[PDB]
Amino acid sequence: QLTEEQIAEFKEAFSLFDKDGDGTITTKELGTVMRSLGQNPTEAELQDMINEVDADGNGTIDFPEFLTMMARKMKDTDSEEEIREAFRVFDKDGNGYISAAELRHVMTNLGEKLTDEEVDEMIREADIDGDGQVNYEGFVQMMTA
Template structure:
């Protein structure tokens, strides 16, 4: 998942970072981090903002330098993209829209689409995913399987 931001995304990030760099010293206060990432299209909770601040403020100064911000922001953007892809994939296979896919459907998908897996790997994934053992896999179970892949 170690994707990089595109040139246009990097320009947008640099521009937004500069707007929040109040004294022009190449640093943004951690207290402004929530507003900064929201200005770039993410919508983190306050808990997530605090986690991002701890992650980006590697030296504990209460200030975030541009390179630290870009590294942290890239990880979070990639994570959001992955979650959106999983939600989209789940919706494709949840034909009835009831919030579940059958273990048989998951088996078919994993054996035949995309990166083909061995029968034993698929059996292990289904055993892990079908936590309740009812033959149905809900969104959380599905996401866990795909993220572990």
């Protein structure tokens, strides 16, 4: 039930990396997402990231090869920090709140075109106090419940 939920979230995350929707993640797709979120991975780094989880050596990541990789992760001493790093990526103006415009910008980077209604619904799900923006607590609770 919690595992059912978790696999669906993992499939969603997979689908967000899979920009072209062909059912596999390429090094180019990983690089495009990482750059769009600000970063600068090297070619050597992108290739390493694939090469560790690429169990059949075809050079791309299919969902089992992504799903196994989530099956390795454990709750650790950097678990809460990891969520905080992600929050900081969404919060583009650094005011401590995720606005609708910030959320929409992230989703567009992840190959998703959301309607106004879809972005609103996402804010509503995470917006605890109903002020129309998402605080850090809102964000953390998303990944707890």
